[PDB]
Amino acid sequence: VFHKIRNEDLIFNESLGQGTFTKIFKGVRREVGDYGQLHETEVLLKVLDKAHRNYSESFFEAASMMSKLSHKHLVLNYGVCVCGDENILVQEFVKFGSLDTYLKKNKNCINILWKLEVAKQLAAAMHFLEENTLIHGNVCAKNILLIREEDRKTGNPPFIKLSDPGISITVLPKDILQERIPWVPPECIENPKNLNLATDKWSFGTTLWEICSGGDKPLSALDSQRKLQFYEDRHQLPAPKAAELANLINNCMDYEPDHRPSFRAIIRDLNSLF
Numbered sequence: 001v002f003h004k005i006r007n008e009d010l011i012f013n014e015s016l017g018q019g020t021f022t023k024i025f026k027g028v029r030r031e032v033g034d035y036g037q038l039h040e041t042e043v044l045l046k047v048l049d050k051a052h053r054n055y056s057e058s059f060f061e062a063a064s065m066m067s068k069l070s071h072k073h074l075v076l077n078y079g080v081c082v083c084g085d086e087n088i089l090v091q092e093f094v095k096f097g098s099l100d101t102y103l104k105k106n107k108n109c110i111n112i113l114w115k116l117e118v119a120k121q122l123a124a125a126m127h128f129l130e131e132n133t134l135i136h137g138n139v140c141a142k143n144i145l146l147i148r149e150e151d152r153k154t155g156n157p158p159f160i161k162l163s164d165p166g167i168s169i170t171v172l173p174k175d176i177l178q179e180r181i182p183w184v185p186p187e188c189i190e191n192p193k194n195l196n197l198a199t200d201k202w203s204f205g206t207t208l209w210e211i212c213s214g215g216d217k218p219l220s221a222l223d224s225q226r227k228l229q230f231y232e233d234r235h236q237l238p239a240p241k242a243a244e245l246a247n248l249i250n251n252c253m254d255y256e257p258d259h260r261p262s263f264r265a266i267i268r269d270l271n272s273l274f
């Protein structure tokens, strides 16, 4: 399952934000690295809420998903912290934070080519999961970490990684799922048991909309019931001003799950864009 990291090797520091029923901190880990060297390693510490330890199993299965596979675009898991009755996941710390908050703060000078490079790296990660038939279940700009910024000095592209999906939507209450529209596909709003490989194709289109919207959350002005109304009326997200990917967003966000393109074809269509 997971490697056990003991209490004394970890130091909890600043709170970075929240996940679903979790608190997230920047931490420091003392470890023996390569060649027996002692390392002070920055880590991420996801602490499942004391009130929500019900979801302890789903909390660790999502991390036991990125752990049993290895890929350059997947966030590394370090293990589980042993202390009290708490549930702590120890994961790779990324300096530049979420793509969600990065697209927002850098919306002014992120051009189409920057969005395209991040879009390909995300599709490449999803293509890797599709070939392994591994359902992620929570693709969004918040679960994406920016490891390297774009270097305009040498034209070096940015680099991203995809973190774990957190507690599965097949287990979360209905108020959270309806709040996650339009990231959760319409067939999962009807029934969370429809979680499938086609779910990640829909959520990829929503993330692709976030990337072209400069941090904007789709359907922010709509509440839960008007998001449920959004799906029943079979509406689609508005075309972003940076519209060179609205056709791919709408094609991925297909109300018929069996018609959403495979991430194979998504990459071809992405690569055929100047």
Ligand SMILES: CC(C)CCN1c2nc(Nc3cc(F)c(O)c(F)c3)ncc2N(C)C(=O)C1C
Pocket: 016, 017, 018, 019, 024, 044, 075, 091, 092, 093, 094, 095, 096, 097, 098, 142, 143, 145, 163, 164
């Ligand atoms: C709650 C949100 C925001 C945490 C996002 N997040 C991560 N963030 C960071 N670095 C980070 C850097 C910052 F300068 C910062 O202000 C910040 F908040 C976070 N490293 C690893 C992750 N890993 C693995 C994750 O799964 C997730 C979800």
